[PDB]
Amino acid sequence: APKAVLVGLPGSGKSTIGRRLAKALGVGLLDTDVAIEQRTGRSIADIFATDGEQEFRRIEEDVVRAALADHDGVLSLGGGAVTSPGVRAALAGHTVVYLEISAAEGVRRTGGNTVRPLLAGPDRAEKYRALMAKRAPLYRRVATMRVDTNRRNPGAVVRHILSRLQVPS
């Protein structure tokens, strides 16, 4: 089972923190979005476009649950996985690091050409605020450590992580 599960909105640093925390802990990183693409042979965008979000969430839940059982390193969950009650259930007992980010920073960090079915223009900031407002309690409900990625150098936030995993609380 994972040493740590990372959750948070798109732009919260899951891929990069993932990478640094994993190196620090000395194991592999698995991103459940990547795992979904590997298992299905499909892009996430095609699943959303052609089959819809609800089908995506069921697939995702299955993959997340498998990963929680079979992966031994750092696991990063796609931003919306926590909207699935079964995903929340499966996370019980695990170490769950919530990467918290404000809307301004998250919006800036997600504005390139990455395809994002649930975060595409116009009014991307409005869409980001809506995801944040809805998902905030869900992230909080599952997390065991929360770290602020707004301003600290990643390498830093991670220190809050390696150190924090190690001592009581």
Ligand X SMILES: O=C(O)C1=C[C@@H](O)[C@@H](O)[C@H](O)C1
SS3 state at 92: coil
CA distance 76 to 64: 9
Residue closer to Mg ion (CB basis): 44 or 67: 44
CA distance 84 to 53: 11
Q: Annotation-wise, does 12 bind a ligand?
A: yes
* Residue 14: C-alpha distances to residues 27, 51, 114, 123, 125 (Å): 16, 26, 15, 23, 19
The mark string for 104-133 relative to ligand X (x by CB under 6 A, - otherwise) is ------------xxx---------------
Which of 31, 33, 61, 100 is in the footprint of Cl ion by CB under 5 A? 61
Whether 12 and 99 have beta carbons less than 8 Å apart is answered as yes
Whether 78 and 32 have beta carbons less than 8 Å apart is answered as yes
Q: Annotation-wise, does 151 bind a ligand?
A: no
Q: Is 11 in the site for ligand X (CB under 6 A)?
A: no
Name which of Mg ion, ligand X, Cl ion, none residue 43 binds, using a CB cut-off of 5 to 8 Å depending on partner kind: Mg ion
Q: Is 124 in the site for Cl ion (CB under 5 A)?
A: no
Q: Is 57 in the site for Cl ion (CB under 5 A)?
A: yes
Q: Annotation-wise, does 57 bind a ligand?
A: yes
Residue type at 138 in one-letter notation: L
Binding residues vs Cl ion (CB under 5 A): 19, 22-23, 57, 60-61, 81, 84
Instruction: Report the binding-site residues for Mg(2+).
Output: 15
